[PDB]
From a paper:
The purified hPBV RdRP (534 aa, ~62 kDa with a N-terminal 6xHis tag) exists in solution as a monomer, based on its gel filtration chromatography elution profile. hPBV RdRP was crystallized in the space group of P21 with two molecules in each asymmetric unit. The crystal structure was solved to 2.4 Å resolution by single-wavelength anomalous dispersion (SAD) using Se-Met derivatized crystals. The polypeptide can be divided into three domains based on their function: an N-terminal domain (aa 1–84), a core polymerase domain (aa 85–470), and a C-terminal domain (aa 471–534). The palm subdomain hosts the three key aspartic acid residues, D261, D359, and D360, of the active site. The hPBV RdRP possesses a highly flexible, 24-aa insertion loop structure (aa 495–518) formed by an internal sequence from the C-terminal domain. This loop structure, which is associated with higher than average temperature factor values, extends from the C-terminal domain towards the catalytic site. In this model, the 3’-end of the template collides with the hPBV insertion loop structure, suggesting that the insertion loop in its current position would sterically prevent the template from binding to the active site of the RdRP as expected in the assembly of a productive initiation complex (right).
Picobirnaviruses (PBV) are small, non-enveloped [name] viruses infecting a wide range of mammalian and avian species. Human PBV (hPBV) has been identified on almost every continent, and has been associated with acute gastroenteritis primarily in children and people that are immunocompromised. The hPBV RdRP possesses a canonical polymerase fold with a 24 amino acids (aa) long C-terminal insertion loop structure that partially occupies the active site of the polymerase. The polymerase domain, which is structurally highly conserved amongst RNA viruses, has a right-hand configuration with three subdomains: the fingers (aa 85–230, 268–324), palm (aa 231–267, 325–414), and thumb (aa 415–470).
Author numbering: 1 to 494, 500 to 511, 518 to 534
Write the structure that this text describes.
């Protein structure tokens, strides 16, 4: 745990007033519930109770959509309540304790079937440090050692080299050696209506130099898979929709579709899972630098130290460091092996229109059952809870959207985001934006980007009308000139970038959003 000052200064550039104040907020927590001005003067309860009166009209035509809405309404509530560090210690422990559950290795044929999906593909080369830096988000925090904006410390960071030496992460940055540690970050996820129901997500904020080295492989990997369409959720929700359609149209007429969920996937992504990820990357990669990368950069996300408080560092191997540049790449490649393994364990072939993304999957194969899947997956040390699994021949959920074989828009089984979930996010934010300092245009833009998720909901027009009420300036209709200049307003403002890399949140194309078109047509 606690290190003397002369140790701490090898991890972080000292003095660091901003890092001191960051950890002070980590210790004390953040207890206030942040409510938006959406339906100001009505409670969260009445907002949902009123929308529900309209919503129930879908229950006769689409009862399982009503069940999906009713399940997500139970989660509506605050997302801004950050517990004090002393109440999150067990959340940290789970990263280190969950990786030693009983676990057996993956089947060879499953690993080969996964590698077959990219048979003809141009092998990946590492992207240079310089080009990798240019592409990445550079306004976000550099982590250890500077805890600054990335753009300000590029030249103190590259050229860099990072590797594990035992339990230490050694980092050489433009000639100087530092010791690397992830900084304990936080995200809130709604999990009920009380302040104490906020889910306390553990975010590992990686050293800039580690993220650069990681992304030298993961940026080319994401790019290649996007163009090949291998992981639809890295492309778009419409690409997800098209593969959901293919899945429903090619499954056995009497087969179920199984929707799997992992409890604490990152924490259980143990060494057995890691070596499958390393093997698959090695098949995608080519050249000597890649061999070097696979031995020295790849392991860091599963073993980097954690700075969880100003004087305090935890060491040891652990599960997926939630927040790594390859957070979703490693897990999605291995989750795909799990899907193949389940069909192969039962003497059949995975329906290739099955999908997965980090801890979320939907699959089918001849004769599939949920119980076979759960057994096949969880023998690898992976935790699953049944009442979060879902099984049906006609519908499924994936990436918090409902899909039905018969619910088609222009031929496609489009995904229906929950109006209840969207209402919770319209009323409740994770951060405070003082009205006096950020203004109504930004709040309105946050609203539009939430509502846009329900663009395929059968009650989307009634839902938009409901949301127009509840906004004083009516989602932009009441702001002079705003809708006519929506592209430009949207650029002053500045989830898919998330699904591809980091896993924290769980561009003038805004003019093509359904919700914008729908508002303009209401003038």
């Amino acid at each position: 745990g606690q290190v003397a000052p002369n140790v701490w200064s090898k991890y972080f550039n000292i003095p660091n007033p901003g890092l001191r104040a960051y950890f002070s907020n980590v210790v004390s927590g953040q207890p206030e519930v942040y409510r938006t001005p959406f339906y100001k003067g009505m409670s969260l309860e009445s907002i949902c109770d009123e929308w529900y009166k309209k919503l129930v009209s879908i229950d006769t035509q689409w009862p399982t959509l009503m069940e999906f809405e009713d399940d997500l309404r139970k989660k509506v509530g605050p997302m801004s309540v950050m517990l004090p560090l002393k109440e999150r210690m067990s959340d940290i422990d789970s990263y280190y304790d969950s990786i030693s559950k009983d676990q057996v290795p993956f089947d060879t044929k499953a690993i080969s079937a996964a590698k077959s999906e990219w048979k003809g593909v141009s092998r990946l080369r590492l992207r240079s440090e310089v080009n990798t830096v240019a592409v990445m988000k550079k306004s976000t925090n550099s982590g250890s050692p500077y805890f600054s904006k990335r753009k300000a410390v590029v030249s103190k960071t590259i050229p860099c080299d990072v590797y594990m030496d035992g339990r230490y992460c050694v980092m050489r940055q433009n000639g100087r050696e530092w010791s690397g540690a992830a900084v304990l970050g936080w995200r809130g996820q709604e999990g009920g209506p009380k302040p104490t129901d906020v889910k306390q997500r553990v975010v590992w904020m990686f050293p800039f130099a580690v993220n650069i080295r990681e992304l030298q492989v993961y940026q080319p990997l994401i790019l290649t898979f996007q163009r090949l369409g291998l992981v639809p959720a890295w492309v778009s929700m419409e690409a997800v929709d098209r593969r959901i359609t293919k899945m429903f149209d090619t499954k056995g007429p009497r087969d179920v579709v199984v929707c799997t969920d992992f409890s604490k996937f990152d924490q259980h992504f143990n060494p057995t899972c890691q070596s499958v990820a390393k093997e698959l990357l090695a098949d995608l990669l080519t050249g000597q630098e890649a061999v070097d990368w696979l031995e020295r950069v790849f392991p860091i996300k599963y073993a980097i130290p954690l700075a969880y408080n100003w004087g305090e560092i935890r060491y040891g191997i652990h599960g997926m460091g939630s927040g790594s540049g390859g957070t979703n790449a490693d897990e999605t490649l291995v989750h795909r092996v799990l899907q193949h393994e389940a069909a192969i364990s039962h003497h059949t072939t995975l329906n290739p229109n099955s999908q997965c993304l980090g801890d979320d999957g939907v699959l089918t194969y001849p004769g599939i059952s949920a119980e076979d899947v759960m057994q096949s997956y969880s023998r690898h040390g992976l935790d699953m809870n049944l009442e979060k699994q879902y099984v049906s021949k006609q519908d499924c959920t994936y990436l918090r959207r409902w899909h039905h074989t018969d619910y088609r828009v222009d031929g496609m089984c489009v995904g229906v985001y929950s109006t209840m979930r969207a209402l919770g996010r319209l009323a409740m934010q994770e951060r405070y934006y003082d009205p006096d300092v950020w203004g109504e245009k930004m709040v309105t833009l946050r609203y539009l980007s939430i509502i846009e998720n329900v663009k395929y909901h059968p009650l989307k027009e009634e839902f938009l009308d409901f949301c127009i009420k509840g906004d004083k300036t009516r989602l932009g209709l009441g702001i002079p000139g705003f809708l006519d200049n929506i592209a430009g307003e949207a650029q002053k403002a500045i989830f898919l970038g998330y699904t591809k890399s980091l896993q924290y949140d769980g561009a003038a194309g805004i003019e093509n959003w359904w919700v914008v078109q729908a508002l303009k047509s209401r003038r």
